């Protein structure tokens, strides 16, 4: 059954390569920084050095809790390949009881 939550976080970031995406996902999950990571190959359009660039990057989505979010973010910036990395945090407003219990117990 659904329960309203405020202690779940979704950290979104993008990395250039698949091998780096896989490593960052596995490393973050194993040390309890993130419970689960999803890797999506996207296409990114932005302005780099004043010039438009269209690149094939990989998008990562870490599922964490509000308690372990700061630890994960600090680890990510220390290890993110890019000098300025994306860090966007969404918060699900609800989740199933079993999944929320599984999420917290994995961190």
């Amino acid at each position: 059954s659904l329960i309203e939550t405020a202690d779940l976080r979704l950290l979104l970031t993008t990395v250039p390569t698949e091998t780096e995406a896989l490593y960052l996902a596995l490393a973050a999950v194993e040390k309890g920084l993130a419970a689960e990571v999803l890797i999506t190959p996207v296409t990114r359009v932005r302005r780099e050095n004043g010039k438009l660039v269209v690149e094939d990057v990989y998008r990562l989505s870490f599922k964490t809790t509000r308690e372990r979010l700061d630890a994960l973010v600090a680890w990510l910036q220390r290890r993110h390949p890019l000098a300025l990395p994306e860090c966007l945090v969404l918060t699900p407003i609800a989740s199933s009881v079993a999944y929320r219990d599984w999420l917290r117990s994995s961190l």
Binding site: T19, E20, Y23, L26, A27, E30, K31, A74, R78, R79
Partner: protein, 120 residues
């Protein structure tokens, strides 16, 4: 006697996220018995979680001198080398970790990333 109490105290403080207090407790434990491989490995883990990679490396090598058959110490040593940009030692550490623990995908992925970063 008192060494084990301090080692357990460091583990408790590490579990709560108090890495600096864990370092003090582990260091205290290492005065009683400097030949505690588990204390050396756990001290390196607290340093690595803090972001200090040179001290984390030093602790991991000490733990491996007293116990070279630690796959986790070898892999975590490679991770510290990766965060420092030193890819030659990261490859050596990750390779040794895979010799001890072949079915470790985090070490396997780290080896691939280290080799690719070396190529570029």
């Amino acid at each position: 006697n008192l060494a084990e109490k301090m080692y357990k105290a460091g583990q408790i403080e590490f579990a709560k996220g108090n890495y600096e207090t864990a370092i003090i407790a582990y260091t205290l434990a290492l005065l009683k018995d400097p030949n505690n491989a588990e204390a050396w490995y756990n001290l390196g883990e607290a340093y690595l979680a803090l972001g200090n990679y040179e001290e984390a490396i030093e602790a991991y090598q000490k733990a491996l001198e007293l116990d070279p058959n630690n796959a986790e110490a070898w892999y975590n040593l490679g991770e510290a080398y990766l965060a420092l940009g030193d890819y030659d030692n990261a490859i050596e550490a990750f390779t040794k970790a895979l010799e001890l623990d072949p079915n470790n995908k985090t070490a396997k992925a780290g080896l691939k990333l280290a080799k690719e970063k070396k190529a570029l």
